[PDB]
């Protein structure tokens, strides 16, 4: 999972859907999706 | 509510020390002098007439 | 909604080369050409 | 031979829109202007 | 001719450039300060975040592929990373509530 | 003739070969391998690791150039080609540093592996003898010591600066018996690769394979391969008086010296002059010195990136040129 | 034009036609069209093909020519102190084609000490490669500079420079090529004359042989500019400061 | 000041003069079959050739 | 064996083997400059040049033209056999100076 | 997010007002090289400096090269700055030519070049207007609702305007068959039944 | 950002020498021209890779979202 | 001769009636499809 993280509170949390838009531990209302665990592939040129 | 330009004495960016501005993640090298009405940042040009 | 040859019920729009033609999936016959957008 | 082979070839052939080429040949980039 | 192009030069933008979300914003990967500076550019701190890099020029005709002010460069220096620019682009949408 | 490029203030002369029969009426200098075997010579200068310097005599400029080109075209080496990424929360985004992985040298030599065949699909294409895998996993954290503020961020944060030594080689099967004696490393394990903050981790593994330098600049085993030609200075009149000390300061300091017996300039140990051509400006040495450049002396200077010894690639250069030219001797001519 | 498919991402044209389009290669963009009949496809070649339009209808002058450095490539070749052995005369003559046209070598100019060809017989071969080519021309013309001879006893050929150019039987006999002999603007040019007396097909076939040469050539001969060849030589300093 | 007018000036007279073709009698005439001049110039020859 | 290699052009050849023009695949100026010099030291040949048609595609055209003594197809077969020996005499002289040092 | 490599087409500049587009991309073997083997990065022809009269790049390249070997950055100001005669003294002590006019071998054939070269580091900044987002083509696409014509604008799939000035240039050739084909066949073909008497 | 790992033109590596260039200026107050020439940068194509290199990655990392 | 890049060359098409002369080439051309360069994009049978 590792769901939405806040901007400067930086607290990992899993928001349940259609419920809120803010984060816990702070009233700040801009939050980022974290990077997946899934493998990705690149080249080297 | 009065939309006010950056680096004016009424904004919080006035006389920062790149530590408050580090916490407010703004560039120290930014000139300032422009509005942030509803997203996009705009600036009023300097007009002249006769 | 219905093709003329195979009577196909699903229509796919090709956006690859920006022709924007609408083609049935089964046999590949085009349903419409030269789209008319509302500018 | 060639002095009238070039003269005869230089004769204006029919069908040329000589109005069109003349308009675009003239259009190109005390006192009087 | 340069002052109309100087506004179109790619380089850095700001220190928070990995944080802002603007419409269509380019970056240069490896910028460098210029070799011959000016007293002007050290007053606006252009050198603190420059635009463009300085390469080794050999002014000459070569292979006829530079006739009037074309340029000729080598495959290796691009493969070493000669100015690999990068395009960042915003896109947005709004969830919208209806009357029902 | 006299195989000397005549340089001057605005030109050079006769830079071509003029070494063929059919150039004059008397057709001399025909092809004879034994008359070349008497004349060809190799001088080796200061030779060591990582770098070489050696001389070649009495060769036309044609096949001297093809040696320089092949050493940075054809002789293969190994570098990263596909970087499989894991969780990576650095500020350096993904394809930037994955480009920087491939530009790091590797100490292991080719001919220990084989060419990869791209016609096969990418499940058995990466075999056990054409592909070796290396990886690194590092997570920056806070170092809980007691410095004061704004000091060096090497003891505030553990492993904040990553280096080439962090690339841990992970052996595949069937080859740990082969690479038991020789572990593989970057040629310079002190290269800065990225910087981190606590809360940011980098995890990936790479597939470095065998590729040719003419495809991409990762695979070139040489730093840079070049050659000079030996400068030659011919003095007409003996320079006497105060002009000789004026003649000395317009050179590199070691190339010519004053005779201490009589006041006359002579030539010291050569091969240390780059052509500054400063003697042409002063218009008082326009007849004293007629300097030139010999068209058969070659200061080969090569140095490796770290893959193998610099004398080996030079041995490998002339060997594969034969194999290049012997290959099409044994193929038919189709109309 | 005819098309040719190449794997890059932009439009590539031969350089000598840039003078009609007055393009400058600085970010200008062109547009191409394609007809879609089987009749109008034949219409565009037989009237708007570039073989039919070497001459402008404004005056009748040859408009496509060598541009601002195809002259100076073909100028250093035709310089009077340009001498070549066979080994280099072979390589120069092999670069004006792709090793396809069969040539025959005229005897060299300097013969007793060694065999030396000049920088003009090589230019004579791009016009007439061999006896099987039907092209043979005759032309007298004046260069751009043309410092005059003694003007009453000496004719135009005996200039102080090479100056007045003479070709008889398609061999260079005097003169150099300095944009008044092979280039644009003047009527009495070389590429005008092969267009005049040998049709349009041989006119294009003789001048792209120059383009494939002067591109490959002078990047291997070398030419540059700097301070010492733009600076005053210190004798213009005391003369300008008083005059 | 010139690039705007010249393309406009070379369009103005183009409109009044666009249809004049040579018939097979070596006589140029308008679209309505009316004579303008009997021969092009004094002799009727191609000016480009 | 292979046939995607040296390949005589039928359009630009003589009726005999006196003049021909061959087309080398997958070889740049590294070979054509070397192969030009080993051929020109044959006293029989009069004309042997090379060129690249277009640098996007990858092929070389070598031109050969000689007198009526030997057919030119026999000359480069001697020619590209001849530098194979020249690669050896450099290799033999060099490797003995390495071991001696 | 995407990045890209500077392949040909991309508009470069020179900071003294020279627009410039990448012509081709050579390999490193074909490039020339000095006595040390330094391979130059960008090539420009000498044919701009007499026309454009850009003396500044001719003296900046001297001001740049002597600063690198001295390890010091040099100031180029207006109405002053570092001069020339004190700058030539630096690199002549390093051993190069006294006005940067060096000489270097050819990478394609080996030997010397008959003229001398001019060499050094210059500051080439990349511009906007890259070519990956200007190439577009409209074969047969959307039509306008009022005119049945192609839609102006690349983001609206394009379809270029064969204007009135090109229409004069067609009939000056006297071609009369693609003139209808490029103006109603591929563009605006529409089939109308009309009555003979009371004609509309 | 960070120093390029190789040179642009020749292509010997300079990644082990950015920290050594900084370490040769805190201690041993020295001229910059004689500093890296002592380190072994004979080619001036290599010398411009470190003179001109503004290192913005220090100023970027102070905007980390992890506090 | 002008050079045309291939990524625009496999978009801009040109119609071509089949004949007994060009039947052999168009059979090999239509099996390429619209992915490799020397192929086709659309087709119209005279009954269609
Ligand atoms: Zn929070
Ligand atoms: Zn009716």
Swiss-Prot record, chain A:
One of its GO terms (biological process) is transcription initiation at RNA polymerase III promoter. It comes from the Eukaryota. Keywords: DNA-directed RNA polymerase, Metal-binding, Nucleus, Peroxisome, Ribosome biogenesis, Transcription, Zinc, Zinc-finger. The keyword Nucleus applies. The N-terminus is blocked. GO terms for cellular component: cytoplasm; nucleolus; nucleoplasm; nucleus; peroxisome; RNA polymerase I complex; RNA polymerase II, core complex; RNA polymerase III complex. A zinc finger (C4-type) spans 6-26. Its main location: nucleus. It is found in: Nucleus, Nucleolus; Peroxisome. One of its GO terms (molecular function) is zinc ion binding. Zn(2+) binds at residues 6, 9, 23, 26. The keyword Nucleus applies. DNA-dependent RNA polymerases catalyze the transcription of DNA into RNA using the four ribonucleoside triphosphates as substrates. Common component of RNA polymerases I, II and III which synthesize ribosomal RNA precursors, mRNA precursors and many functional non-coding RNAs, and a small RNAs, such as 5S rRNA and tRNAs, respectively. RNA polymerases are composed of mobile elements that move relative to each other. In Pol II, the core element with the central large cleft comprises RPB3, RBP10, RPB11, RPB12 and regions of RPB1 and RPB2 forming the active center. Belongs to the archaeal Rpo12/eukaryotic RPC10 RNA polymerase subunit family. Present with 907 molecules/cell in log phase SD medium. This is DNA-directed RNA polymerases I, II, and III subunit RPABC4. It comes from Saccharomyces cerevisiae (strain ATCC 204508 / S288c). The gene is RPC10.
From Swiss-Prot, chain B:
It comes from the Eukaryota. It is found in: Nucleus. Present with 1950 molecules/cell in log phase SD medium. DNA-dependent RNA polymerase catalyzes the transcription of DNA into RNA using the four ribonucleoside triphosphates as substrates. Second largest core component of RNA polymerase III which synthesizes small RNAs, such as 5S rRNA and tRNAs. Proposed to contribute to the polymerase catalytic activity and forms the polymerase active center together with the largest subunit. Pol III is composed of mobile elements and RPC2 is part of the core element with the central large cleft and probably a clamp element that moves to open and close the cleft. Component of the RNA polymerase III (Pol III) complex consisting of 17 subunits. Belongs to the RNA polymerase beta chain family. This is DNA-directed RNA polymerase III subunit RPC2. It comes from Saccharomyces cerevisiae (strain ATCC 204508 / S288c) (Baker's yeast). The gene is RET1. The chain holds residues 151 to 200 of 1149 of the full protein.
UniProtKB/Swiss-Prot annotation, chain C:
A zinc finger (TFIIB-type) spans 1-32. Zn(2+) binds at residues 3, 6, 24, 27. It is found in: Nucleus. Present with 4330 molecules/cell in log phase SD medium. Belongs to the TFIIB family. TFIIIB comprises the TATA-binding protein (TBP), the B-related factor (BRF) and the B' component (TFC5). General activator of RNA polymerase III transcription. Interacts with TBP. Binds to Pol III subunit C34 and to the TAU135 component of TFIIIC. This is Transcription factor IIIB 70 kDa subunit. The gene is BRF1. The chain holds residues 2 to 40 of 596 of the full protein.
Curated annotation (Swiss-Prot), chain D:
It is found in: Nucleus. It comes from the Eukaryota. Belongs to the RNA polymerase beta' chain family. Present with 6020 molecules/cell in log phase SD medium. Component of the RNA polymerase III (Pol III) complex consisting of 17 subunits. DNA-dependent RNA polymerase catalyzes the transcription of DNA into RNA using the four ribonucleoside triphosphates as substrates. Largest and catalytic core component of RNA polymerase III which synthesizes small RNAs, such as 5S rRNA and tRNAs. Forms the polymerase active center together with the second largest subunit. A single-stranded DNA template strand of the promoter is positioned within the central active site cleft of Pol III. This is DNA-directed RNA polymerase III subunit RPC1. It comes from Saccharomyces cerevisiae (strain ATCC 204508 / S288c). The lineage of its organism: Eukaryota, Fungi, Dikarya, Ascomycota, Saccharomycotina. The chain holds residues 1072 to 1120 of 1460 of the full protein.
